[PDB]
Amino acid sequence: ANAFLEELRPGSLERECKEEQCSFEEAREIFKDAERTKLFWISYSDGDQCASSPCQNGGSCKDQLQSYICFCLPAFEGRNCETHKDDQLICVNENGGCEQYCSDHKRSCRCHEGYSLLADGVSCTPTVEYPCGKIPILEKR
Amino acid sequence: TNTVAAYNLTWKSTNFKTILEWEPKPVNQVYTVQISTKSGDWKSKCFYTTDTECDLTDEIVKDVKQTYLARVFSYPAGEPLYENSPEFTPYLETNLGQPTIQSFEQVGTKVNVTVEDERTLVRRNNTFLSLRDVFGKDLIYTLYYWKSSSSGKKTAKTNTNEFLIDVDKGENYCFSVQAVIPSRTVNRKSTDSPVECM
Amino acid sequence: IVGGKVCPKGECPWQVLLLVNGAQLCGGTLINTIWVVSAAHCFDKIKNWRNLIAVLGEHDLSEHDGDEQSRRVAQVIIPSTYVPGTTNHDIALLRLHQPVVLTDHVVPLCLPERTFSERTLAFVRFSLVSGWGQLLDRGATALELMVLNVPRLMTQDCEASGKITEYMFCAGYSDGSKDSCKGDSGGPHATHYRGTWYLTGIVSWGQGCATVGHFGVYTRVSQYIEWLQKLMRSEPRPGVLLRAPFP
Ligand SMILES: *[C@@H]1O[C@H](CO)[C@@H](O)[C@H](O)[C@H]1O
Ligand SMILES: *[C@@H]1O[C@@H](C)[C@@H](O)[C@@H](O)[C@@H]1O
Ligand SMILES: C[As](C)(=O)[O-]
Ligand SMILES: C[As](C)(=O)[O-]
Ligand SMILES: [Ca+2]
Ligand SMILES: [Ca+2]
Ligand SMILES: [Ca+2]
Ligand SMILES: [Ca+2]
Ligand SMILES: [Ca+2]
Ligand SMILES: [Ca+2]
Ligand SMILES: [Ca+2]
Ligand SMILES: [Ca+2]
């Protein structure tokens, strides 16, 4: 930028374009060569997309070319970390965590005949000796 | 009909931050996205969303070497209508993020230029891994440096994140590094980093 | 089964062998002590409905190790919508005259709920198919029970070839190497999910065994869950064949 008698000093990219907001004419004063000046103005014109703080729920942003990327926390996902893992517990989502049958309404798990639902409310276990869909010679001894 | 198939399924990935995008906006319908490997089961993401995008980062970081295929279903609001996305191999197709010159330092007729390690979205060990922890010997950085009084631009390259270049004494230099993977026909080079002068 | 492997004795305890006049007819699937699921086209040419036998615990046809359990088929039930000579609605529900005894070699395959099979099992990629059918296209049948692992395809992808209906689905390889074949019809298409196997398909039909650019077609069992469970609570009619209304 140009303040009182600033242009008496030699131009510097740091003080003028980085520390303040330089114009194309101030950039030309530092690079002199036009072809190299234009190459700088393309990348310089692309601002910091993280200035708006798009990320959410304690996510960190990183500026990119005409875009950005959000580093979400473990329990979060999405372009802006807006999605929570826990708020998706339904039968479409990994069978709702149920080992066998699932039902929407909190989702309720159930078991096929011959099995029975445990205390965890998701796991099934055989109640009979020969439950369906299991190989005895592989689940014995 | 009661539904229309999605289209323009495109992959948007940078530092393994993978986003699937498609069209159009929903009208009397909702979308569900599925993703799998070549021989893996289909896992669903973004269940019945009105969004025309879906973040698949958590699914592909489990193994960035694997080729992934996805599809977008269309439910109204025997099988529902859908559309397949192009195959996607993260390790070979993800865009290299814009590098950043961490620091530079001169000692006489030589200058050292250090590059900041770019953190990726691969959250191994409960922390984001850097760009070099993934590609290793495949990743290199190219340095573009020049004088204000130079005609063209000199170039340097390093297997690490530090350049050890020679300079003309007294002269003022500028710098700009670029991430590169020579073992790539597509997405071979990143975008140029911000300039840093002495 | 083409390009498959011999299923070790006891590792396919739900596989049923159906016979007519002592001759090999078709495969089947034990879903409980009394009822067996199979394909409908296998019963198109039957004359002696009394000479219909279902064997369980079988492995080697050329030997009798004592693990086999034979039962008379009391009642064969098929959808009214089914038409002999066509492919649609190719499923049959058989009632064994007396219940079989469950052993280490005789165990039924779980009949899943509709929603569960449609939401989860349908998206498990690979499933097992087995039977004593031909080992090659227009070849000899197998003596030892063969088994094969194949991936499931959605109808939109399989129609890269409206021949496949909503009561069907494709599965196998279009490379011409691994596929179910003639004689395996009626056999189980079993899908695994968390330590439990479920019935999701029935060997139905195809355009040549292991033909390039084509997959094997299987009856979509999830369509007949309510229909089957309904009949398993019905009073048996005296006639062997019984065309029940569907749905
Ligand atoms: C500012 O924030 C908006 C959304 O909050 C985002 O779209 C822009 O990219 C960012 O700069
Ligand atoms: C940036 O990264 C994310 C993942 C969170 O750890 C934030 O707290 C941090 O500032
Ligand atoms: C290795 As095995 C066919 O005996 O489970
Ligand atoms: C059984 As086909 C119509 O996919 O060749
Ligand atoms: Ca200034
Ligand atoms: Ca100025
Ligand atoms: Ca400064
Ligand atoms: Ca200033
Ligand atoms: Ca100036
Ligand atoms: Ca000036
Ligand atoms: Ca930017
Ligand atoms: Ca035998």
The number of C-alpha atoms within 13 Å of C40 and in the hemisphere containing its C-beta is: 23
- Cα torsion at C160, C161, C165, C170 (round to 10°)? -80
- Ligand 1 pocket, residue A49 CB under 6 Å: yes
CA C94, C100, C106, C110 torsion-angle sign: positive
Residue C179 assigned to a binding site: yes
For residue A13, how far is its CA from the centre of ligand 10 (angstroms)?
12
Contact A43 B128 (CB under 8 A): no
Experimental method: X-ray
Measure the CA–CA gap between C119 and C178, rounded to whole angstroms.
Answer: 27
Residues B88 and B110 sit within 8 Å (Cβ to Cβ): no
- As a whole number of angstroms, the longest Cα–Cα distance in chain B is 76
- Ligand 2 pocket, residue A59 CB under 6 Å: yes
- Report the residue from A43, A71, A77 with minimal CB separation from B55: A77
Q: Where are the domains of chain A?
A: 12-141
Domains B1-93 and B94-198 share a fold: yes
Closest CA in chain C for residue B5? C156
**H or E, element range at C122:** none
Pocket mutation for ligand 2, best pick of A55, A68, A71 (most atoms within 8 Å of C-beta): A71
Phi and psi angles of residue C29, each rounded to the nearest 5 degrees, phi first: -140, 120
Measure the CA–CA gap between A92 and B49, rounded to whole angstroms.
Answer: 13
Q: How far out from the chain centre does Cα C102 lie?
A: 19
Contact C10 A130 (CB under 8 A): no
CATH of domain C1-12+109-222: 2.40.10.10
Query: Which letter, b or e, does each residue of C61-95 get, where b requires 16 or more Cβ atoms within 10 Å of its Cβ?
Result: beeeeebbbebebbbbbbbeebeeeebbbbbbbbb
Q: How far out from the chain centre does Cα C131 lie?
A: 9
Convert chain A into a string of H (helix), E (strand) and C (coil).
CCCCCHHHCCCCHHHHHHCCCCCHHHHHHHHCCHHHHHHHHHHHHCCCHHHHCCCCCCCEEEEECCEEEEECCCCEECCCCCEECHHHCCCCCHHHHCCCEEECCCCEEECCCCEEECCCCCCEEECCCCCCCCCHHHCCC
Whether chain B has a CB inside 8 Å of the CB on A99: the answer is no
Measure the CA–CA gap between B34 and B196, rounded to whole angstroms.
Answer: 44
| Kind of pairing between the strands at C197-205 and C146-153 | unpaired
The residues near C114 (Cβ < 8 Å, ≥ 6 apart) are C222, C225, C226
Rounded to the nearest angstrom, the minimum Cα separation between C162 and chain A is 28
Instruction: Select from 3.40.50.720, 2.40.50.140, 2.40.10.10, 2.40.160.60 the CATH code of C13-108+223-236.
Output: 2.40.10.10
Query: Shortest CA distance to C138 belongs to which of C64, C222, C208?
Result: C208
Q: How far apart, in Å, are the Cα atoms of C3 and each of B62, C9, C130, C134, C150?
A: 33, 19, 12, 10, 11
- Report the residue from A102, A112, A132 with minimal CB separation from C107: A132
Point out which residues pair with B147 in neighbouring strands. Answer: B173
Which chains are adjacent to chain B, needing at least 3 Cβ pairs under 8 Å?
A, C
Residues A111 and A127 sit within 8 Å (Cβ to Cβ): no
> Can you identify the CATH homologous superfamily of domain B94-198?
Immunoglobulins (2.60.40.10)
Rounded to the nearest angstrom, the minimum Cα separation between A119 and chain C is 18
Query: Shortest CA distance to A41 belongs to which of A19, A24, A29, A56?
Result: A24
Rounded to the nearest angstrom, the minimum Cα separation between C68 and chain B is 36
- Cα torsion at B116, B117, B121, B126 (round to 10°)? -110
Q: Where are the domains of chain C?
A: 1-12+109-222, 13-108+223-236
- The residue with tokens 């691994």 is C178
The residues near A15 (Cβ < 8 Å, ≥ 6 apart) are none
Residues A72 and A78 sit within 8 Å (Cβ to Cβ): yes
Helix (H, G, I), strand (E, B) or coil at B136: helix
Residues B146 and B154 sit within 8 Å (Cβ to Cβ): yes
- Helices (H), strands (E): how many in chain B? 3, 14
Q: Which of C117, C125, C126 to mutate to test the interface with B (most CBs of B within 10 A)?
A: C125
Q: How far apart, in Å, are the Cα atoms of A40 and each of A37, A53, A63, B174?
A: 5, 26, 17, 11
Residues C43 and C78 sit within 8 Å (Cβ to Cβ): yes
The number of C-alpha atoms within 13 Å of B144 and in the hemisphere containing its C-beta is: 17
Written as six digits, the tokens of A39 are 């190459």
Residues C105 and C17 sit within 8 Å (Cβ to Cβ): no
Measure the CA–CA gap between C24 and C98, rounded to whole angstroms.
Answer: 21
Helix (H, G, I), strand (E, B) or coil at B64: coil
Measure the CA–CA gap between C13 and C59, rounded to whole angstroms.
Answer: 9
Q: Which atom of ligand 2 is nearest to the CA of A59?
A: 3
Q: Where are the domains of chain B?
A: 1-93, 94-198
For residue A63, how far is its CA from the centre of ligand 1 (angstroms)?
11
Contact B97 A62 (CB under 8 A): yes
- Report the residue from B41, B81, B84 with minimal CB separation from C125: B41
Name the CA radius of gyration of chain B, rounded: 22
Point out which residues pair with C24 in neighbouring strands. Answer: C19
- Ligand 2 pocket, residue A73 CB under 6 Å: yes
Q: How far out from the chain centre does Cα B132 lie?
A: 13
Written out in words, the top-level CATH class of the domain with range B1-93 is: mainly beta
Closest CA in chain B for residue A37? B148
Residues C7 and C145 sit within 8 Å (Cβ to Cβ): yes
Q: Which of C102, C105, C196, C200 to mutate to test the interface with A (most CBs of A within 10 A)?
A: C196
Whether chain A has a CB inside 8 Å of the CB on C110: the answer is yes
